[PDB]
Ligand binder design. Structure first.
Ligand code: NAG
Ligand code: CA
Length: 71
């Protein structure tokens, strides 16, 4: 209750605490926090595009996937 499985990453400054995307820190250290349309990878210091229409029925008909959005 004073710690987490992730601990003592730097604050969101030194190469964003190692994050390659949008980022902040709680008292435990920095993480990425991906914008709308993106997800956190395993590493929690990088973000990946969601394939928003690999999900069946997200688009009623023809779909294309693009970085951070869909058409
Ligand atoms: C990490 O990647 C695997 C696929 O290699 C995925 O199944 C898993 O959900 C990921 N970890 C987390 C915390 O979601
Ligand atoms: Ca996308």
């Amino acid at each position: 209750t004073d710690e987490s499985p992730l601990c003592n990453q730097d604050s969101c400054s030194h190469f964003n605490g190692g994050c390659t995307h949008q980022c902040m820190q709680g008292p435990f250290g920095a993480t990425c926090l991906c914008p709308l349309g993106y997800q956190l990878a395993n590493d929690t210091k990088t973000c990946e595009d969601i394939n928003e229409c690999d999900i069946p029925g997200f688009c009623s008909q023809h779909c294309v996937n693009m970085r951070g959005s869909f058409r």
